[PDB]
Amino acid sequence: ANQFSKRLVHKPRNPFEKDRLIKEMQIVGKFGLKNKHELRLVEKNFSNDKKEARLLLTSNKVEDISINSRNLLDKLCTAGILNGIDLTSKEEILNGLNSILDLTIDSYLERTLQYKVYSSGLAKSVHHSRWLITKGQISIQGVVIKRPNYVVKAEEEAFIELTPYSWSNNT
Amino acid sequence: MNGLFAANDLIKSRKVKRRSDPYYRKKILGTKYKHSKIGNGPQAKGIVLEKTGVEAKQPNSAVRKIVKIQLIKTGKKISAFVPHDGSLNYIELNDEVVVEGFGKKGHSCGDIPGISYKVVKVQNVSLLALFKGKKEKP
Amino acid sequence: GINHRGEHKRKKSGGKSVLHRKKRNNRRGSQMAATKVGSTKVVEKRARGGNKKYKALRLNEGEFLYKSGNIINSSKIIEVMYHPTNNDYVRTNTITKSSVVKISSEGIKIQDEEDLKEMYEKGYLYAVINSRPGQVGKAEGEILQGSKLEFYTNLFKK
Amino acid sequence: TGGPRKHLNRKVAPTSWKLDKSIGTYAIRPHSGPHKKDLCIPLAYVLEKFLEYANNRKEIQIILKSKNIKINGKIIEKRKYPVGFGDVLSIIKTDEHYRVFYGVDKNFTFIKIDKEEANFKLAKVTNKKVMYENVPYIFTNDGACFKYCDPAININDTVKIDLETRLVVDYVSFKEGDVVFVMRGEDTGRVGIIKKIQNTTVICEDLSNKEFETSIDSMIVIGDNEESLLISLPEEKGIRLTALEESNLKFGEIVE
RNA sequence: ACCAGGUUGAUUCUGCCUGACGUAGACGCUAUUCCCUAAGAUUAACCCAUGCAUGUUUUUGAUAUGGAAAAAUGGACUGCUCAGUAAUACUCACUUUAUUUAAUGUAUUAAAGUAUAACUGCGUUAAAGUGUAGCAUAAGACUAUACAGUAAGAGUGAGACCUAUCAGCUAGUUGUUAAGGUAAUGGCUUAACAAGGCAAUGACGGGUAACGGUAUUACUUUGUAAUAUUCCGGAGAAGGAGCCUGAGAGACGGCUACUAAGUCUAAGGAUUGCAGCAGGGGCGAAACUUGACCUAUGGAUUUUAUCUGAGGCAGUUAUGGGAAGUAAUAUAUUGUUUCAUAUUGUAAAAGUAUAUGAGGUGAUUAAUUGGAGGGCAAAUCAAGUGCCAGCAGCCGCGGUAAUACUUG
Ligand SMILES: [Mg+2]
Ligand SMILES: [Mg+2]
Ligand SMILES: [Mg+2]
Ligand SMILES: [Mg+2]
Ligand SMILES: [Mg+2]
Ligand SMILES: [Mg+2]
Ligand SMILES: [Mg+2]
Ligand SMILES: [Mg+2]
Ligand SMILES: [Mg+2]
Ligand SMILES: [Mg+2]
Ligand SMILES: [Mg+2]
Ligand SMILES: [Mg+2]
Ligand SMILES: [Mg+2]
Ligand SMILES: [Mg+2]
Ligand SMILES: [Mg+2]
Ligand SMILES: [Mg+2]
Ligand SMILES: [Mg+2]
Ligand SMILES: [Mg+2]
Ligand SMILES: [Mg+2]
């Protein structure tokens, strides 16, 4: 269809496997997701950089080790899935793409604002966070967010608080 | 015909061998415009004329209930199969029906012989819902 | 009315051709205007984007140039002697480009040459037109002298 | 289509006009003028987008009918007037003057200049022949004619127009080792030193000591020497660093 | 970067059918929000009731303080559709010393007499339109070229679907000389002469349910397939032909004739083209309001107040893609939607956002669709019927104990 109306993700290849539904149901109940569909969105972009990580190891260009690969390592580091590395040194750039292949789906699924509340002391359960966010009681440093699947970047991690003027506080 | 400068002899030879594909042969002759039974569409309309039954093939034994209609778009006569139990009691003569196909690429499936169409609507009432009992027939 | 398109002709191989659009106004033609001899008459034309053209229906007293003495003088036009492409124009007296004529030698002051002397006793001399009459609107030409007179006189009626 | 076109579309608009490809559908088709189709911009976009003096269509007519806008020393009140390359526009009020040439990233810029530079103008000769009654003539790029000039000015040399008396005042000849300015091609806005002049291209040297080749029609020499510098240069001076050094300044250089 | 079931008393192969998965249209059942995005292309390039989409401007000033006419300027752009065309149309690379250009920019040159309107006044016909007077009476009309700049015409070469039950084809056809005509090259047209031109590297024929590229989607190990849909280009206004004005029309919300369909009449005559926006009829399996407006982007020769069904803003529809709901902590506590109200906002009205009000419920205002022998996740659970009624894409169940039909 048109660009505004194409679809992003399809059905899996084998609809009924007992060896696939058991593995995935351990992820839904642990992280607290409502649809099987919304799990499929976060794994495809996990596949797409791994499609790009393989090419940069095999590039024979002298500048591709300098530009696009360094433009690969930053984007994960701003969201904070990767921890941090020195971009001036050449040999650690090789280590950065080699560390990329050792990730999982849970490295992406853990930096979500629903789970990141419960891992802090604000929420008791993960289901306590989904019921709390939608009423509008939780705020980042200036903004009041109502989307539990909002990705939390690296620098904005420590500044999660309650809303100061909500009924969840005293006022 | 394996050579570096033999592209003119390779394309001319491989077009001849491609004509023995049984799916590709019907695309060249255009048989779906020439010898189509219903036209080119998902459904059709018709007028009922008879209510008759047929007998299925061996080794099974039953009586399959069908209906002989006449289409509007082309004007031909054709037979369709009533697809559910106790559904023929709704049907009266001099009425309109809607016809849907079986889904086996123009062939007959099951043990019903020579018939490739089934009824879906009677008087703009869904026969799948009317068997469930949600609606009533006027 | 009269087109100058090229879409109607056959191919290089000889196969037929097919059209796909109607007649355009860009390639537009006209009919032939045959300039006769008589009393003078000039009509005007309108061409594409102004640019007026003049056509002459009946022409008289054309201008000619003497090559040896290098002067220009007017003379009358009497008869036509030769026309290259079609030999029927000599009986209908039509003047076109490069068709030799017969002019009066009254106002002309000629030098003393051997060839022109015998015709100069009578009234007539020879000239050849060099301008497009139907589009410029007036005739100009040269007087025959020397071996150029030797070439045309083999083609005369005799 | 039996005649000319009068409507232009925003998607086929030039990207150097810095327009948004958002909600609009049509764009202003400017008038015919001295400049080409590439080096011209409409006037109504200048008072709206680049300069910020008006908000809607009504305030455009207020500044234009008040007769303060002065392009090449002339008052103009038409919003469809094309502003070309190199011309100096000014307001009579507030003594504000600008020169118009491209930036570094193939976009139009406006640079505030001084009143000593506000007088003159630069152009480039393209053709020269002698007209009727034995009078010499020199034809520039924009279409102005000039007679009785110095015979040392050749076909490719540049001139200096006084813009008030409309007389040729100074000229700079065309040779090697001259500072140059480019305005077209894949490389626009480069300022360079001439090293080798070929018959159709020129082999040049950037201020960052690089190299590029460019046809002769796309350049204009602004000075014979580095110390001349007849005009004022832009702030970047047209260096246009590569994407490697843009990747070097962000993250530091690669230690080896 | 992945395979499974089916030929035999059992085994190994070739070979096909079927299951699992995409992309465009139609259909059955069920639906609470918000933002974005789409809607008579497929059959009929079939016929249309009604209403509306092209006029501006002191240039002069209607026995008339601001409007009659006449002049000037644009109606050839914009918008709608895909019938025809297999290449002449389109894309790319070149040429035009072989050509034309109103409105634009810079320069060169030159400088008394003569109509018709509006007005006043006599009329005509069913209608549609038109006539005779007042020596009637106004403004107007009787410079030429260069070089840039936009716009267009004309050439050369290369690329592009199926068919041999289509193997020979072409006579203004191929060339020479000359003329006419065009703004211009050219058998573009006409005289005279000559016999040339193309083909298994597919000529000449036949078919298409064939408008060409492109932005953009899929699937991939050197690349295939779709592309009416965004944008550029070409062709047509019931079917054919011809022409006026004009810088630019072989123009159709301009004129003339013939063919197919009509409509008004007082019977002598007069008249119409919705593949423009709404809307109706027919056709079909198949597609929306006979709605408001110049707010923003534009066009009309300076466009700050004129016009603008181009173009915006709202209503109807499971056309699709997003951010979300229908509970949480241990009967109880707290508190999301279905209700209303301020401000912001709108051309004027919605709507979104920020704040504020009440009432008390998750058996509620707040969940459906398909399946349970194998492929293929899930019952030899119960009651009826007995090769009947029926189910099953393929293999296959139904003969009084059916996990394979009907109900729970
Ligand atoms: Mg199927
Ligand atoms: Mg149609
Ligand atoms: Mg008038
Ligand atoms: Mg079609
Ligand atoms: Mg067609
Ligand atoms: Mg009169
Ligand atoms: Mg002949
Ligand atoms: Mg296409
Ligand atoms: Mg029609
Ligand atoms: Mg038109
Ligand atoms: Mg047309
Ligand atoms: Mg016509
Ligand atoms: Mg019409
Ligand atoms: Mg319509
Ligand atoms: Mg529909
Ligand atoms: Mg159920
Ligand atoms: Mg199982
Ligand atoms: Mg089935
Ligand atoms: Mg089953």
mmCIF file of N, CA and C in Angstrom, chain D residues 131-198:
data_model
loop_
_atom_site.group_PDB
_atom_site.id
_atom_site.type_symbol
_atom_site.label_atom_id
_atom_site.label_comp_id
_atom_site.label_asym_id
_atom_site.label_seq_id
_atom_site.Cartn_x
_atom_site.Cartn_y
_atom_site.Cartn_z
ATOM 1 N N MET D 131 29.666 47.148 -33.019
ATOM 2 C CA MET D 131 28.317 47.355 -33.523
ATOM 3 C C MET D 131 28.327 48.369 -34.665
ATOM 4 N N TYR D 132 27.140 48.893 -34.975
ATOM 5 C CA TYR D 132 26.932 49.858 -36.048
ATOM 6 C C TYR D 132 27.772 51.116 -35.860
ATOM 7 N N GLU D 133 28.187 51.688 -36.999
ATOM 8 C CA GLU D 133 28.903 52.968 -37.090
ATOM 9 C C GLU D 133 30.226 52.946 -36.330
ATOM 10 N N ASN D 134 30.842 51.759 -36.275
ATOM 11 C CA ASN D 134 32.195 51.534 -35.759
ATOM 12 C C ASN D 134 32.316 51.936 -34.290
ATOM 13 N N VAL D 135 31.471 51.340 -33.462
ATOM 14 C CA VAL D 135 31.471 51.554 -32.019
ATOM 15 C C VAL D 135 31.679 50.201 -31.348
ATOM 16 N N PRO D 136 32.691 50.047 -30.495
ATOM 17 C CA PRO D 136 32.912 48.751 -29.845
ATOM 18 C C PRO D 136 31.900 48.519 -28.737
ATOM 19 N N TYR D 137 31.660 47.248 -28.430
ATOM 20 C CA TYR D 137 30.709 46.884 -27.394
ATOM 21 C C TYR D 137 31.187 45.662 -26.625
ATOM 22 N N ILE D 138 30.775 45.597 -25.363
ATOM 23 C CA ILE D 138 31.104 44.501 -24.464
ATOM 24 C C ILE D 138 29.819 44.066 -23.773
ATOM 25 N N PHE D 139 29.515 42.774 -23.847
ATOM 26 C CA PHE D 139 28.284 42.222 -23.304
ATOM 27 C C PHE D 139 28.595 41.402 -22.062
ATOM 28 N N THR D 140 27.867 41.670 -20.987
ATOM 29 C CA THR D 140 28.055 40.986 -19.721
ATOM 30 C C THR D 140 27.091 39.810 -19.600
ATOM 31 N N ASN D 141 27.056 39.210 -18.408
ATOM 32 C CA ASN D 141 26.192 38.056 -18.185
ATOM 33 C C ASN D 141 24.730 38.462 -18.088
ATOM 34 N N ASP D 142 24.445 39.582 -17.423
ATOM 35 C CA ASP D 142 23.059 39.945 -17.159
ATOM 36 C C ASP D 142 22.361 40.541 -18.370
ATOM 37 N N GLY D 143 23.104 40.992 -19.370
ATOM 38 C CA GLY D 143 22.503 41.572 -20.548
ATOM 39 C C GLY D 143 22.671 43.063 -20.695
ATOM 40 N N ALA D 144 23.558 43.678 -19.923
ATOM 41 C CA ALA D 144 23.860 45.084 -20.119
ATOM 42 C C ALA D 144 24.912 45.251 -21.205
ATOM 43 N N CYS D 145 24.782 46.328 -21.972
ATOM 44 C CA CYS D 145 25.719 46.651 -23.035
ATOM 45 C C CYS D 145 26.586 47.816 -22.587
ATOM 46 N N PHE D 146 27.859 47.790 -22.972
ATOM 47 C CA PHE D 146 28.801 48.831 -22.598
ATOM 48 C C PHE D 146 29.746 49.109 -23.753
ATOM 49 N N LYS D 147 29.991 50.391 -24.002
ATOM 50 C CA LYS D 147 30.774 50.843 -25.138
ATOM 51 C C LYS D 147 31.942 51.687 -24.653
ATOM 52 N N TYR D 148 32.925 51.850 -25.548
ATOM 53 C CA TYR D 148 34.093 52.722 -25.363
ATOM 54 C C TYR D 148 34.904 52.360 -24.124
ATOM 55 N N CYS D 149 35.090 51.070 -23.883
ATOM 56 C CA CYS D 149 35.856 50.644 -22.727
ATOM 57 C C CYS D 149 37.327 50.483 -23.091
ATOM 58 N N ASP D 150 38.100 50.028 -22.114
ATOM 59 C CA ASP D 150 39.523 49.812 -22.319
ATOM 60 C C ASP D 150 39.739 48.616 -23.243
ATOM 61 N N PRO D 151 40.663 48.710 -24.202
ATOM 62 C CA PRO D 151 40.898 47.568 -25.102
ATOM 63 C C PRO D 151 41.638 46.407 -24.456
ATOM 64 N N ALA D 152 42.113 46.550 -23.216
ATOM 65 C CA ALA D 152 42.814 45.448 -22.564
ATOM 66 C C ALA D 152 41.850 44.459 -21.920
ATOM 67 N N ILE D 153 40.546 44.736 -21.968
ATOM 68 C CA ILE D 153 39.572 43.812 -21.403
ATOM 69 C C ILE D 153 39.186 42.779 -22.449
ATOM 70 N N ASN D 154 39.409 41.502 -22.131
ATOM 71 C CA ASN D 154 39.134 40.408 -23.055
ATOM 72 C C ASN D 154 37.770 39.772 -22.820
ATOM 73 N N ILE D 155 37.504 38.636 -23.466
ATOM 74 C CA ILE D 155 36.178 38.027 -23.504
ATOM 75 C C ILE D 155 35.809 37.428 -22.151
ATOM 76 N N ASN D 156 36.803 37.003 -21.371
ATOM 77 C CA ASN D 156 36.534 36.221 -20.172
ATOM 78 C C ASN D 156 36.823 36.980 -18.884
ATOM 79 N N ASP D 157 37.303 38.213 -18.970
ATOM 80 C CA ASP D 157 37.713 38.980 -17.806
ATOM 81 C C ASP D 157 36.489 39.575 -17.123
ATOM 82 N N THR D 158 36.636 39.931 -15.850
ATOM 83 C CA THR D 158 35.520 40.494 -15.105
ATOM 84 C C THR D 158 35.621 42.013 -15.018
ATOM 85 N N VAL D 159 34.480 42.650 -14.751
ATOM 86 C CA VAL D 159 34.376 44.101 -14.686
ATOM 87 C C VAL D 159 33.852 44.506 -13.316
ATOM 88 N N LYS D 160 33.769 45.819 -13.109
ATOM 89 C CA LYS D 160 33.284 46.420 -11.871
ATOM 90 C C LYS D 160 32.333 47.553 -12.237
ATOM 91 N N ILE D 161 31.040 47.338 -12.014
ATOM 92 C CA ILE D 161 30.018 48.298 -12.419
ATOM 93 C C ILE D 161 29.758 49.265 -11.273
ATOM 94 N N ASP D 162 29.754 50.566 -11.583
ATOM 95 C CA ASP D 162 29.631 51.592 -10.550
ATOM 96 C C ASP D 162 28.215 51.665 -9.989
ATOM 97 N N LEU D 163 27.227 51.207 -10.762
ATOM 98 C CA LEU D 163 25.805 51.013 -10.433
ATOM 99 C C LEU D 163 25.038 52.336 -10.304
ATOM 100 N N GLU D 164 25.702 53.489 -10.334
ATOM 101 C CA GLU D 164 25.001 54.766 -10.281
ATOM 102 C C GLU D 164 25.177 55.576 -11.553
ATOM 103 N N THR D 165 26.393 55.655 -12.075
ATOM 104 C CA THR D 165 26.635 56.248 -13.380
ATOM 105 C C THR D 165 26.559 55.220 -14.499
ATOM 106 N N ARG D 166 26.458 53.931 -14.143
ATOM 107 C CA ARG D 166 26.369 52.803 -15.078
ATOM 108 C C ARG D 166 27.573 52.748 -16.014
ATOM 109 N N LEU D 167 28.749 53.061 -15.483
ATOM 110 C CA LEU D 167 29.966 53.104 -16.276
ATOM 111 C C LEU D 167 30.953 52.063 -15.775
ATOM 112 N N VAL D 168 31.671 51.449 -16.715
ATOM 113 C CA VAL D 168 32.724 50.518 -16.349
ATOM 114 C C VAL D 168 33.871 51.294 -15.726
ATOM 115 N N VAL D 169 34.250 50.906 -14.512
ATOM 116 C CA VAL D 169 35.270 51.608 -13.739
ATOM 117 C C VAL D 169 36.575 50.822 -13.695
ATOM 118 N N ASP D 170 36.542 49.608 -13.153
ATOM 119 C CA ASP D 170 37.745 48.803 -13.030
ATOM 120 C C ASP D 170 37.482 47.423 -13.617
ATOM 121 N N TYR D 171 38.564 46.733 -13.967
ATOM 122 C CA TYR D 171 38.486 45.375 -14.471
ATOM 123 C C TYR D 171 39.621 44.557 -13.878
ATOM 124 N N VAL D 172 39.400 43.250 -13.804
ATOM 125 C CA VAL D 172 40.422 42.296 -13.403
ATOM 126 C C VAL D 172 40.546 41.266 -14.515
ATOM 127 N N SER D 173 41.761 41.078 -15.018
ATOM 128 C CA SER D 173 41.985 40.163 -16.121
ATOM 129 C C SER D 173 41.907 38.715 -15.648
ATOM 130 N N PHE D 174 41.950 37.802 -16.611
ATOM 131 C CA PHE D 174 41.852 36.375 -16.345
ATOM 132 C C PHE D 174 43.209 35.726 -16.585
ATOM 133 N N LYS D 175 43.767 35.126 -15.538
ATOM 134 C CA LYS D 175 45.064 34.470 -15.615
ATOM 135 C C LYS D 175 45.134 33.422 -14.512
ATOM 136 N N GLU D 176 46.296 32.791 -14.390
ATOM 137 C CA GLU D 176 46.507 31.818 -13.331
ATOM 138 C C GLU D 176 46.954 32.511 -12.046
ATOM 139 N N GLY D 177 46.798 31.799 -10.935
ATOM 140 C CA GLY D 177 47.141 32.337 -9.637
ATOM 141 C C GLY D 177 46.194 33.429 -9.192
ATOM 142 N N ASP D 178 44.914 33.286 -9.530
ATOM 143 C CA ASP D 178 43.884 34.228 -9.123
ATOM 144 C C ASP D 178 42.932 33.546 -8.152
ATOM 145 N N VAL D 179 42.368 34.331 -7.243
ATOM 146 C CA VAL D 179 41.312 33.828 -6.373
ATOM 147 C C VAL D 179 40.020 33.766 -7.181
ATOM 148 N N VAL D 180 39.193 32.760 -6.912
ATOM 149 C CA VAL D 180 38.058 32.442 -7.766
ATOM 150 C C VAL D 180 36.841 32.200 -6.878
ATOM 151 N N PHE D 181 35.652 32.331 -7.457
ATOM 152 C CA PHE D 181 34.393 32.001 -6.807
ATOM 153 C C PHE D 181 33.553 31.197 -7.789
ATOM 154 N N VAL D 182 32.893 30.156 -7.299
ATOM 155 C CA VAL D 182 32.067 29.303 -8.144
ATOM 156 C C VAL D 182 30.615 29.442 -7.698
ATOM 157 N N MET D 183 29.681 29.250 -8.629
ATOM 158 C CA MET D 183 28.269 29.473 -8.355
ATOM 159 C C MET D 183 27.364 28.366 -8.869
ATOM 160 N N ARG D 184 27.891 27.398 -9.610
ATOM 161 C CA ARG D 184 27.067 26.324 -10.138
ATOM 162 C C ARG D 184 27.822 25.011 -10.012
ATOM 163 N N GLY D 185 27.315 23.998 -10.699
ATOM 164 C CA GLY D 185 27.919 22.685 -10.664
ATOM 165 C C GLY D 185 27.580 21.936 -9.395
ATOM 166 N N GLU D 186 28.210 20.768 -9.254
ATOM 167 C CA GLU D 186 28.014 19.970 -8.048
ATOM 168 C C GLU D 186 28.712 20.605 -6.854
ATOM 169 N N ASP D 187 29.711 21.444 -7.110
ATOM 170 C CA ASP D 187 30.439 22.157 -6.072
ATOM 171 C C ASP D 187 30.145 23.639 -6.213
ATOM 172 N N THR D 188 29.317 24.169 -5.321
ATOM 173 C CA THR D 188 28.989 25.584 -5.300
ATOM 174 C C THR D 188 29.620 26.233 -4.080
ATOM 175 N N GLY D 189 29.960 27.510 -4.215
ATOM 176 C CA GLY D 189 30.432 28.278 -3.083
ATOM 177 C C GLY D 189 31.857 28.012 -2.660
ATOM 178 N N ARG D 190 32.667 27.390 -3.503
ATOM 179 C CA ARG D 190 34.073 27.161 -3.208
ATOM 180 C C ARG D 190 34.886 28.378 -3.619
ATOM 181 N N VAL D 191 35.822 28.775 -2.763
ATOM 182 C CA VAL D 191 36.751 29.863 -3.040
ATOM 183 C C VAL D 191 38.135 29.254 -3.199
ATOM 184 N N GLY D 192 38.767 29.493 -4.343
ATOM 185 C CA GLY D 192 39.995 28.784 -4.643
ATOM 186 C C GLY D 192 41.078 29.554 -5.370
ATOM 187 N N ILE D 193 42.298 29.015 -5.356
ATOM 188 C CA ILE D 193 43.409 29.623 -6.080
ATOM 189 C C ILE D 193 43.681 28.836 -7.352
ATOM 190 N N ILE D 194 43.790 29.545 -8.471
ATOM 191 C CA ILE D 194 43.984 28.909 -9.770
ATOM 192 C C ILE D 194 45.403 28.367 -9.863
ATOM 193 N N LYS D 195 45.528 27.105 -10.271
ATOM 194 C CA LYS D 195 46.821 26.486 -10.532
ATOM 195 C C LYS D 195 47.051 26.222 -12.014
ATOM 196 N N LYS D 196 46.108 25.554 -12.675
ATOM 197 C CA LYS D 196 46.226 25.220 -14.086
ATOM 198 C C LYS D 196 44.927 25.560 -14.799
ATOM 199 N N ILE D 197 45.048 26.274 -15.916
ATOM 200 C CA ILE D 197 43.918 26.636 -16.763
ATOM 201 C C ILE D 197 43.940 25.744 -17.993
ATOM 202 N N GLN D 198 42.925 24.897 -18.132
ATOM 203 C CA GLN D 198 42.760 24.121 -19.347
ATOM 204 C C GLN D 198 41.838 24.854 -20.316
#
